[PDB]
Amino acid sequence: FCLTLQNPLRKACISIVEWKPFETIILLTIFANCVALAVYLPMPEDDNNSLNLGLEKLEYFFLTVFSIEAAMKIIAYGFLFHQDAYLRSGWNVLDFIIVFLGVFTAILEQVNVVKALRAFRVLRPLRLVSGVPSLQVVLNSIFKAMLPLFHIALLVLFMVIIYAIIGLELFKGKMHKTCYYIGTDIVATVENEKPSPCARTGSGRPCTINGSECRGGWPGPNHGITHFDNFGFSMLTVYQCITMEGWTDVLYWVNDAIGNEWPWIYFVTLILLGSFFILNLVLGVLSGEFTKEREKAKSRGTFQKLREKQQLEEDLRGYMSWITQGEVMNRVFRWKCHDLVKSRVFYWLVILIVALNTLSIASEHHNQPLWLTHLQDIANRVLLSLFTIEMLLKMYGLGLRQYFMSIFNRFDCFVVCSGILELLLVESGAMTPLGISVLRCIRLLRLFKITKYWTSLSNLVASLLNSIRSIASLLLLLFLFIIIFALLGMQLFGGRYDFEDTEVRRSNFDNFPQALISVFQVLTGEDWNSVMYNGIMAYGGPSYPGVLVCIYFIILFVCGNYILLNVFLAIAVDNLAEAESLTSAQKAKAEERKRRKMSVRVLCHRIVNATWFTNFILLFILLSSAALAAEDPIRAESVRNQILGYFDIAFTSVFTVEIVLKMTTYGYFNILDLLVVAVSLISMVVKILRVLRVLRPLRAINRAKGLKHVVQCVFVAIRTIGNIVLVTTLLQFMFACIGVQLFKGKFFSCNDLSKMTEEECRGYYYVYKDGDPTQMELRPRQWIHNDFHFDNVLSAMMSLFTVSTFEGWPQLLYRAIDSNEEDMGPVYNNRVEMAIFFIIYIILIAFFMMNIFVGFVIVTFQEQGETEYKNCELDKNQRQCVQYALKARPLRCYIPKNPYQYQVWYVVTSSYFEYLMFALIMLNTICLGMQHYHQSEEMNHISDILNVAFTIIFTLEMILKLLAFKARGYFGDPWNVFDFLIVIGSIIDVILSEIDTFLSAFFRLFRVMRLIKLLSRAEGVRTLLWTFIKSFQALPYVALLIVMLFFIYAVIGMQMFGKIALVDGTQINRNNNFQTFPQAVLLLFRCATGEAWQEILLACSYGKLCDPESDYAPGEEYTCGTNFAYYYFISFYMLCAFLIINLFVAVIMDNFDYLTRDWSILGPHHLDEFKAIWAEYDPEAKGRIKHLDVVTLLRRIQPPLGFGKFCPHRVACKRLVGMNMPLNSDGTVTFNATLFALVRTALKIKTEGNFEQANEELRAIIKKIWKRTSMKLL
Amino acid sequence: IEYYYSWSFACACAAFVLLFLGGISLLLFSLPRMPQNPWESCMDAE
Amino acid sequence: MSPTEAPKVRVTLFCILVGIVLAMTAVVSDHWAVLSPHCEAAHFGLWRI
Ligand SMILES: COc1ccc([C@@H]2Sc3ccccc3N(CCN(C)C)C(=O)[C@@H]2OC(C)=O)cc1
Ligand SMILES: [Ca+2]
Ligand SMILES: [Ca+2]
């Protein structure tokens, strides 16, 4: 704010004017500009209205102000080295780039007296954030957590590439055939089927439309967006499957192409690998990054601020009662109402009239009886009095000064007043036609009074409200991020959905309210592919300019779901840490209070004691189960179902013998193993006993010692968690009861949308196919009720659960926005303000209230990592680090002899060779991405040549890498074992290809799998893959509950839902079904990812028609399915979600050391580089090296462990000697304590004398003896 | 005109099912282990 | 020793030695195509048909 190369003030006075409101008169100016973009209404094909013609003048006015002021800051400074300076701060580079490109589009639009340069105009709400420096530390809290997620993002990119070149080579050009009406170009479907690929005499679906034939002139399955037949459309359709919206459409379109049995392994392996497993790494690095910063907020000063001011507040509220209870004390009558209140008579009988108010509210429903209408005005008039009695008792009988001091009594006086507001307003004839129900929505506040009865989360609800200058500083910056993308898509896509189809694309970008709703839907992830397909068909199509629209919705979905993880996860982590530590400090505050006031048989055991017997039971449990697996649902008479039915009596020989044998030696888990055979013997209603036969696996978690341990750790984690799960189900219940006041009776609708009520919705009507007004067909019209609706509290909670998950919530948003009146069909964009119900519900539940479940688990499983306390001399890192130095073992590197052979060896392992082969692999990928569909023949041959040309080269790196290591050393390094595997199968790719032309697809995949050798160099990524793959193998039991839970739910599902017929057009079709056990498991997987599971649920509920290969008494075709489907599917979604974030959190808490490593100080990545240079002197292990080597060995080490960047004549001549070391012979010094000695200089500096007490901390902190302390003490 | 098998298909599509599955198991049983701990390395002495 | 003396590697290797002949069954058996016109049945293999 000075010059140094300054110009006199005459022109420098300007600097004075810049004082306090000068910044805020132009910060007020820009909020007027943001409204000036939000009322611009985009209109198609160069059309306008009056208000956009008076706004373009306004743009000119706005531009000038920015320019005048962005000229009066470079000359409020001065010269060229003073506008050099203003620019210097990067916040004023954006402020110049906007307003210079601002006047550029006032010029070029006035020369042609363009519209893609009218979209830099949307960047001006960022100029708003440079003005408030309070938010510049908030963006820099989001950008600062992105440099750790670097090595994850690079790993997603070598999987979106790998599955693209796999999916190119297999799936290219297959999906170009559809059923067509004979001799037309009209594609044939059923009413509710989207058009799919078919095959002629293959394994695909044969066309079965009647008068339909299968031909190949078809462009693709979503107009040609999602196919696999060049590298850009293979990479766009794989990226779609990773985000898990509509991966089961790509899977089922391949099953109607090439066939049914092989392509499932592509989509399932991919989904798990790039979705359920990347999302494990993202929630580990991010979880560890938010924990290493709370330690650096512990270590600056910030702990006392939420402790002192907390305890300065509760001592302030307590010191107020020591005066104000003596401001009052005036009869016996004013005292006996004080003994009344604090007694348990009152706190257990005011909870009686809260429960009368819930039951009054939770009995509203549509078409309710006239008595229960009349009852609820009596019970409102009563419960308004009983709240008013206990307020007038409270405002006088204990004084109005204690009353106002409370946080919760402030609510009560309002509720009594706002309840008596209604009985004065509605008893007037001043009914106010909408406010007669708004004040019915008001009295819904009375059930928020029950929140006071928790008193278990009021260390979190307290800790919440301490952070609401910080909660809201993030929910603003998310809310600013939408308003750029809300308004960018009003440019690109406003108007522009001017299709001539008769279908509705309601998630469009026409207004500002609508654009905002659309942007949000793509952030919840739900159905964003439809919003993207419309943006590609809004431009040309699947062409070269039209498809770069697709990178709007990639920057939108990636970088917008990145902000969601930096807010909800962080809030739940930082806010949860305080709500726990303060409760754990109310531990130590309270137990220090309570101590002040106090102060033949014998053969049989051997027979079932032997290991073989225990294992003999297990392969009869692993076989008893897998006969339920292969059982036929549809036929109770099959030759298979008989020959598997004999195993019901063939396995209950052995499980009958053992239970008699068990009860000789003896006489909880034990009774179930009797109970399994009990059902298995009585089954030798008949149907309902087969269901209880499913528990044959559950008698296998009595046998394993490991399987008992996991199910007990899960039941621990419900007794903890089951405080949050109950509060949500209270808050779920409130929003359910608003929805019955808004949307009750309103979700009826006729069949054609012209008939508004039920009396008119009779008779028949026309439908027009493809909107041709010549191709019409009768249908009867019928008044259909919606499926998921809000009509009582029970169905309103059914609907809310689905929205909370994120499935099918836009079809409830539009059924609500279009909602008209009481018993009447819809009206287009009637209530566009009722998008706030479904957004406030989602922001509360599905992004926040749920974020406390994971945050809670992550935090309270660092308490299982903190009920074990090891307060020795050594810090855990030191101790963990120390553990390294004891338990090591050197490597083998097999440096050769025979200097012919050596002459290869140095040339191979040099980095100008590692660059050479890691360029040829990079070139070999580009040749595989060149392949495409309807390519020419001059590519067909140079495809096949380079298939031979590369294969010879990676052969010739393998003959050389045999010569240098002489075989024994080549098969020691397991990348070379994989490299041997690739070289062979690549040769068989050549030979098997040519011998057909000289006279299968699997060996084409050894051309793509050679890319995985990139992992042999990325030490930052190969460590990250190793550390998370180490710990899926280390927890093989939690991943066997999820295996077991899919097994049980499939077999019950095959049982009840197995006879639903495969009509096509519904959700039980030839791709989705419970008619085998692989079909069922696959179906369960669809629901665990949440594809259309609520739309599956409706498709298997009693009404559905049975297949004819079943049997039934005829006249009962429409009888199968059952209303057990609601219990089946809602229970499955809640158990699987619990058992997955179980397995997610357990993997984080093994890598809790890596994830929070703090790379600066000392780690094993330094300690790896010891054994690297230790390999340089011992080729094979053999213990020791010479003493002269340790002179030269030590300069090879980085100064965070070794010696500095100085010339080592001063320290190393001393530190090698003056620091103690084990003294072996003249040419011997051991491996392990050499490593122990050099970390001891870095960490744990101990003086002379502690050579045995440092073996005392190395023998009490230590475990098993490991008697090598003789070579590790001194 | 059908296709049917009671000998060769179920032996050769057992021999495939044998040899593909045993060699992979033989492969996993001579590669060392996932190192589980920051000092171990595949290919470490003995 | 420890990769080659273990019971998991010697159970495995003998199970390799079983199915080495099961292909050699199929290499001289000709049985896994049964034609049925109805007589004109055929029995196809790898050499003999
Ligand atoms: C059944 O399979 C699931 C999937 C997701 C979850 C929870 S909550 C949730 C609920 C509904 C839809 C998505 C979610 N998401 C999706 C948001 N993320 C992309 C940001 C999660 O990430 C949560 O998982 C975690 C560890 O974050 C739990 C079980
Ligand atoms: Ca979804
Ligand atoms: Ca979905």
Swiss-Prot record, chain A:
One of the protein's GO biological processes: calcium ion import across plasma membrane
III repeat segments: 600-861
Ranges that cross the membrane: 21-39, 55-75, 85-105, 114-132, 150-171, 263-283, 345-363, 375-395, 407-426, 436-454, 474-493, 546-565, 612-630, 643-662, 668-684, 686-704, 724-743, 832-853, 912-933, 942-963, 974-993, 1000-1018, 1037-1057, 1125-1149
Motif (Selectivity filter of repeat II): 524-527
Tissue expression summary: Detected in skeletal muscle T-tubules (at protein level).
Motif Selectivity filter of repeat III: where in chain: 805-808
Subcellular location: Cell membrane, Sarcolemma, T-tubule
Cytoplasmic side: 76-84, 133-149, 396-406, 455-473, 705-723, 854-911, 964-973, 1019-1036
Membrane topology label: Multi-pass membrane protein
Region (Dihydropyridine binding), start-end ranges: 781-870, 1105-1171
Start and end residues of each stretch annotated as Binding to the beta subunit: 310-327
Intramembrane region list: 233-254, 514-535, 794-814, 1080-1098
GO CC, alphabetical: L-type voltage-gated calcium channel complex; plasma membrane; T-tubule
Enzymatic reactions: Ca(2+)(in) = Ca(2+)(out)
Protein task: Pore-forming, alpha-1S subunit of the voltage-gated calcium channel that gives rise to L-type calcium currents in skeletal muscle. Calcium channels containing the alpha-1S subunit play an important role in excitation-contraction coupling in skeletal muscle via their interaction with RYR1, which triggers Ca(2+) release from the sarcplasmic reticulum and ultimately results in muscle contraction. Long-lasting (L-type) calcium channels belong to the 'high-voltage activated' (HVA) group.
Domains (record comment): Each of the four internal repeats contains five hydrophobic transmembrane segments (S1, S2, S3, S5, S6) and one positively charged transmembrane segment (S4). S4 segments probably represent the voltage-sensor and are characterized by a series of positively charged amino acids at every third position. The loop between repeats II and III interacts with the ryanodine receptor, and is therefore important for calcium release from the endoplasmic reticulum necessary for muscle contraction.
Protein name per the record: Voltage-dependent L-type calcium channel subunit alpha-1S
From Swiss-Prot, chain B:
Coiled coil: none
Subcellular location: Cell membrane, Sarcolemma
PTM info: N-glycosylated.
Cytoplasmic side, ranges: 32-46
Source organism superkingdom: Eukaryota
Entry's transmembrane regions: 7-31
Tissue expression summary: Skeletal muscle (at protein level).
Family recorded in the similarity comment: Belongs to the PMP-22/EMP/MP20 family. CACNG subfamily.
Record's protein name: Voltage-dependent calcium channel gamma-1 subunit
Organism: Oryctolagus cuniculus (Rabbit)
Swiss-Prot record, chain C:
Annotated organism of origin: Oryctolagus cuniculus (Rabbit)
Transmembrane residue ranges: 11-29
Stretches of the chain found on the membrane's Cytoplasmic side: 1-10
UniProt note on tissues of expression: Skeletal muscle (at protein level).
Post-translational modification: N-glycosylated.
Subunit structure: Component of a calcium channel complex consisting of a pore-forming alpha subunit (CACNA1S) and the ancillary subunits CACNB1 or CACNB2, CACNG1 and CACNA2D1. The channel complex contains alpha, beta, gamma and delta subunits in a 1:1:1:1 ratio, i.e. it contains either CACNB1 or CACNB2.
Gene: CACNG1
Function (record text): Regulatory subunit of the voltage-gated calcium channel that gives rise to L-type calcium currents in skeletal muscle. Regulates channel inactivation kinetics.
Family label: Belongs to the PMP-22/EMP/MP20 family. CACNG subfamily.
The name this protein goes by in its record: Voltage-dependent calcium channel gamma-1 subunit
Signal peptide: none
Compartment(s): Cell membrane, Sarcolemma
